[PDB]
Paper text:
C-MET receptor, which belongs to the receptor tyrosine kinase (RTK) family, plays essential roles in controlling a number of critical cellular processes such as cell proliferation, survival, motility, and morphogenesis. C-MET can be activated by its cognate ligand—hepatocyte growth factor (HGF). Structurally, the c-MET receptor is composed of a Semaphorin (SEMA) domain, a plexin-semaphorin-integrin (PSI) domain, and four consecutive immunoglobulin-plexin-transcription factors (IPT1-4) domains in the extracellular region, a single transmembrane helix (TM), and an intracellular KD. HGF, the ligand of c-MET, is secreted as a single chain 83 kDa precursor protein containing an N-terminal (N) domain, four consecutive kringle (K1–K4) domains, and a serine protease homology (SPH) domain.
NK1 is the native isoform of HGF, acting as an alternative c-MET agonist. To understand how NK1 activates c-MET, we determined the cryo-EM structure of the 2:2 c-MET/NK1 complex at an overall 5 Å resolution. Due to the structural flexibility, the entire stalk regions of two c-METs in the c-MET/NK1 complex were poorly resolved that the IPT1 and IPT2 domains of c-MET can be only visualized in the cryo-EM map low-pass filtered by local resolutions. In contrast to the binding mode between c-MET and HGF, NK1 forms a stable head-to-tail dimer on its own, which recruits two c-METs to both sides in a symmetric manner. In such structural configuration, the two c-METs are placed in relatively close proximity, which enables their intracellular KDs to undergo autophosphorylation and thus initializing the downstream signaling. NK1 engages with c-MET through the K1–SEMA interaction, which is virtually identical to that utilized in the formation of the c-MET II/HGF I complex. We superimposed the model of NK1 dimer onto that of free NK1 dimer, which was previously determined by X-ray crystallography. This comparison revealed no major structural differences between the free and c-MET bound NK1. Indeed, weak densities that could be attributed to heparin were observed on top of two N domains of NK1 dimer, but cannot be modeled due to the low resolution. First, HGF recruits two c-METs in an asymmetrical manner that contrasts with the C2 symmetry observed in c-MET/NK1 complex.
Author numbering:
A (entry chain A), C (entry chain B): 37 to 208
B (entry chain D), D (entry chain C): 33 to 107, 111 to 145, 152 to 164, 169 to 204, 210 to 305, 310 to 399, 414 to 557
The structure:
């Protein structure tokens, strides 16, 4: 049930701007079969790197690409749900993690990070609608401010408002 | 160049002879409780109509409160201050006042409101109609189960009074009966001297009673604290009694940290749609708005660094419910005492530690001046607050998280600091007025605007919200109709 | 059931050479509860980065570290099963992936890689007992030869013996 | 300096007058089938004991095969070559031989083995006792259900013969009855001219019959190919008949690719424990060992670049079963024909495409010379092979994936190329001997060693396996007992 592992952008799909890319489209019941099929590339002639599920058509669209691949257009669509591969999500930070988008969502001390959009416990100025450039989603530690500390999250701990998360840097 | 800071505008104005303890709006009549006096005015023009005096009374211990003792040649003459004013409308439209001069002997009066007087005494070890304290108290009443229920926080000098209690008036309208002993909560006599408690506001939302208090951070802590207190509304007594500390702090978000412990005043309302999202609260939701001050070290004195911040009531309720660890919950120190039998374990009273924090809404705009009174209203989508000042200046600001908005209305009212007690009235077509105290003078201020001429740059005039529909007449900010030609931006 | 996600070294445990490290030890029934607990740091005062399960004692040992953390000793123990965090396994290649050890185990074209130790379809000189330095385990694409192409696997396809896998390089 | 390449050692040796078609070991007697002759020897000393000649027979079409026709003054005298030799032991210990001179008219003989002769004829549209082909065939028999079953691959010049068939001898011992028509498989007459088929080895493992063939890669492909053929062992006929191509190739492992299509010979055995892991096969498991040659372009001619490689029988069985895609499975081209009715869809015969590959075990050690015969045995943990040569050189190598082992035994036998047919016998205490053909001379070679003096460096002598227990006498490799003093490393 790896569907839970892959990253979900709801109400979102992708369109390829490059002709060379090939999309594997097939109607099924649920995105669960899409995830199972892309997981092991079932009948997939390529390196499946994302898939968009359409509930209206109940159809999988499998891609050897995803959002971070160049030449791809992000499209808001309520019937479209985009899913990206974590194993195709770089899980070490380049600099201050300014571009990092992986799903590590726990404080360095080991505390559960709070949802960004929610304001409990702590209200804050940083919001997805306000801040669309960095594209924080629910709890993924980010540094939209580009703070030296790296990606941080507002702790769900009432006592501590915020904490920088722990990532292994790509220290060559 | 920037803004004509103070410009004097003459408005409908009433002046009194004594400081005003209370202001109330009810049925086209303005009810003011001032020292020794009870003024009644026409809402439209601030023309004083009728008043009932309560002049400085004679005091003698032998004389019982209600019956007047003009035969006391041996004893003092002491001034009377109205502790609280209440208006009853579920029954006959009438006014119930209480002053400290008679040890909280409330009197009620059933155009003029001085028509009748009824001294509320019900003659015995404890006094069930010694209602209000003298040095400090807060009162708020609301119709509960067709009987107006009275919520009374009390301060005691350690010299029959209870810290907080709820009493109900008998239909005979003669006095109040404490249904239960847990209907009141008391500080221990040892600590009655220390650990001062003060009340600032009270209200109800969503079937729950909320009081706001400032008092020492802990017993023998030599430091103060702001807390809210919530409990159910049951005539029998205070059952789901809980309190927790509140904190307002602004700091850089990622990881300049200053904290404003001391509360000053507050106001309850509904938000504007733009800011409803700015705080992630529904437009229907009720929100408290608090004004806070920092303290001098281990002092109740407020330094002149003030802030305000908002609180979704659901947020506070949730923090009461689940968001805090069950371990940090501690015993009620000043009620049960540290050496409490039930400490190691309807019935219980609770005390909380990890304060709920909220950030400043004005990003420190007033880290230089002190703030006294607050009021909230909406204009279409927008929401606007009318602030109070320790100096006495008055101003209005469009409240929104989207950057700091300059005071679209600002000037300096009378010499007295702005009193905390205000009443804002909204009439249809987005016209309304604030009733604001300053010493012994009331002021009624329109909502729509106070003269667009207070602008000193084209950019300054452009920030004026569109509901004013006033603009730049090519050299100065005056509206379109008073811009002779069309060169009006 | 993230236990399946984490990487398993059977018959293996770790011992800390640094005093500062703290281990969270507790007896349970199965390593499944160890994985659930380390997953969200349940009662864990640190950034859980690995855990060793002991069947004999039925005890979890949780660590803010793992094999690749410095100052840790690898110990063969049949009653010990070490489990490492994938999200604490760098999933992009440094150079030719010479040190890469992530679990991407599919050819660039999208084919299932064959087990290293097994010889079906294709026998080969590269074996775990022979090659202990690089520490290939079942199917994780490796470059123990350090071939330019990067980590590769011998395809389970009978027609094609081998293929280089597809990794996103840490291209700053 | 390095190794005394050839040193001539005199061993127990038998010489014949005609080339040897076959060599068989059974019950302390060595049975050799040579052109026109049937030699029987003592196993111990290669002393020839008795022989039955089958001299160059007279040929006349009118004369039936079995009855001799010495009355034929009109006609040719043609030489007789024994196609195959078989030994029966489940019944009386007896020897059944077949030669091409009489159109495969087998004869059987029940110390001397020439005691009796029985001409196997059972007198009709098809010939059920025209057993062996002339230009090319392979024979192997084993007791099946108490009747010796005979497996006969046949080559045809397109001039009653079947490509492959299984026949059984009647208890009367007179001839063979084809139980079913599917007991044989035939090439179509159109293609009977083309698409040549040759057989090299046959055997059984795990209740299955395996033949090894070389023939054109496809019909009208103008290119050759090596395949194995497996089918069940049922007297009725060939039911689970399948074939697949085999390839032996060495290339750099990560991603110098040369392929040796043409097979030469093979041997079936069990492995050594060290190499059992080297190939991931159980020690109990049986393994085939194949020697292969490359082809000249579109030729059956083998160039002198040879290799060998091993095959776990389970591996081949699995490749038969599941490892290959069901799509690539194709029709049997030369049986049914491309324009086959059943092509679009016990009964079926199958043909496979994607060849099973195995890598070289000698990493190209013999990309310069050509290899003819093979034999396998074990010495404690170790496994050792005895190779054959197109030149005729003989050598023995410790077979192991752990690096290439130099030939611990090497020299040059007679002028003839080493014939493919060998018989190795292992007696207790790890002493044994190989029986090897070279033209018309047999050679019996010990397993334990052939004279440790063939070494020309101390390092060279150190590589000698410990089972020889021969070492360096401080200047030359001779063993301890013949090292006078103790300076023996």
């Amino acid at each position: 049930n790896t569907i839970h592992e892959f990253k979900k952008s709801a109400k979102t799909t992708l369109i390829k701007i490059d002709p060379a890319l090939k999309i594997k489209t097939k109607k099924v019941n649920t995105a669960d079969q899409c995830a199972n099929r892309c997981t092991r590339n079932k009948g997939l002639p390529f390196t499946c790197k994302a898939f968009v599920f359409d509930k209206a058509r109940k159809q999988c669209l499998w891609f050897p690409f995803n959002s971070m691949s160049s030449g791809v257009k992000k499209e808001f669509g309520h019937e479209f749900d985009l899913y990206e591969n974590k194993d195709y999500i770089r899980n070490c930070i380049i600099g201050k993690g300014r571009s990092y988008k992986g799903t590590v969502s726990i404080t360095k001390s080991g505390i559960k990070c709070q949802p960004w959009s929610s304001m409990i416990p702590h209200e804050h100025s940083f919001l997805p609608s306000s801040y669309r450039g960095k594209d924080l989603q629910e709890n993924y530690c980010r540094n939209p401010r580009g703070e030296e500390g790296g990606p941080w999250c507002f702790t769900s701990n009432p006592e501590v408002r915020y904490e920088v998360c722990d990532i292994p840097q790509c220290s060559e | 160049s920037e803004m004509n800071v103070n410009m004097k505008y003459q408005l409908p104005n009433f002046t009194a002879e004594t400081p005003i303890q209370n202001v109330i709006l009810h049925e086209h009549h303005i009810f003011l409780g001032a020292t020794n006096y009870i003024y009644v005015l026409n809402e439209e023009d601030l023309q004083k109509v009728a008043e009932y005096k309560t002049g400085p009374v004679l005091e003698h211990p032998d004389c019982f409160p209600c019956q007047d003792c003009s035969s006391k040649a041996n004893l003092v003459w002491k001034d009377n201050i109205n502790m609280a004013l209440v208006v009853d409308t579920y029954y006959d439209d009438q006014l119930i006042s209480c002053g400290s001069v008679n040890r909280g002997t409330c009197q009620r009066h059933v155009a003029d409101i001085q028509s009748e007087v009824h001294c509320i005494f019900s003659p015995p070890s404890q006094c069930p109609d010694c209602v209000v304290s003298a040095l400090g108290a807060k009162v708020l009443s609301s119709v509960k189960d067709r009987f107006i229920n009275f919520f009374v926080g009390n301060t005691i000098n350690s010299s029959p009074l209870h810290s907080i209690s709820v009493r109900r008036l008998k239909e005979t309208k003669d006095g109040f009966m404490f249904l239960t002993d847990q209907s009141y909560i008391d500080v221990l006599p040892e600590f009655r001297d220390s650990y001062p408690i003060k009340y600032v506001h009270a209200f109800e939302s969503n079937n729950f009673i909320y009081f706001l208090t400032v008092q020492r951070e802990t017993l023998d802590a030599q430091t103060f604290h702001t807390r809210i207190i919530r409990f159910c509304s049951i005539n029998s007594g205070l059952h789901s009694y809980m309190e927790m500390p509140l904190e307002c702090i602004l700091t850089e978000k990622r990881k300049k940290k200053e904290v404003f412990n001391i509360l000053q005043a507050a106001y309850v309302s509904k938000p504007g749609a733009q800011l409803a999202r700015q705080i992630g609260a529904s437009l229907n939701d009720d929100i408290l708005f608090g004004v806070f001050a920092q303290s001098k070290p281990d002092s109740a004195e407020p330094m002149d660094r003030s802030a305000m911040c908002a609180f979704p009531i659901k947020y506070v309720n949730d923090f009461f419910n689940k968001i805090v660890n069950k371990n940090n919950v501690r015993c009620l120190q000043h009620f049960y005492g540290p050496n409490h039998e039930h400490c190691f374990n309807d019935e219980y009273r609770t005390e909380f530690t990890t304060a709920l924090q909220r950030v400043d809404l004005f990003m420190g705009q007033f880290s230089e001046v002190l703030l006294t009174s607050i009021s909230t209203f909406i204009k279409g989508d927008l929401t606007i607050a009318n602030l109070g000042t320790s100096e006495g200046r008055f101003m209005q600001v469009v409240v929104s998280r989207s950057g700091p908005s300059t005071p679209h209305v600002n000037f300096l009212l009378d010499s007295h600091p702005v009193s905390p007690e205000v009443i804002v009235e909204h009439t249809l077509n987005q016209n309304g007025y604030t009733l604001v105290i300053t010493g012994k003078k009331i002021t009624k201020i329109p909502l729509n605007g106070l003269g667009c001429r207070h602008f000193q740059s084209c950019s300054q005039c452009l920030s004026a919200p569109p509901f004013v529909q006033c603009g730049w007449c090519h050299d100065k900010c005056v509206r379109s109709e008073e811009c002779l030609s069309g060169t009006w931006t």
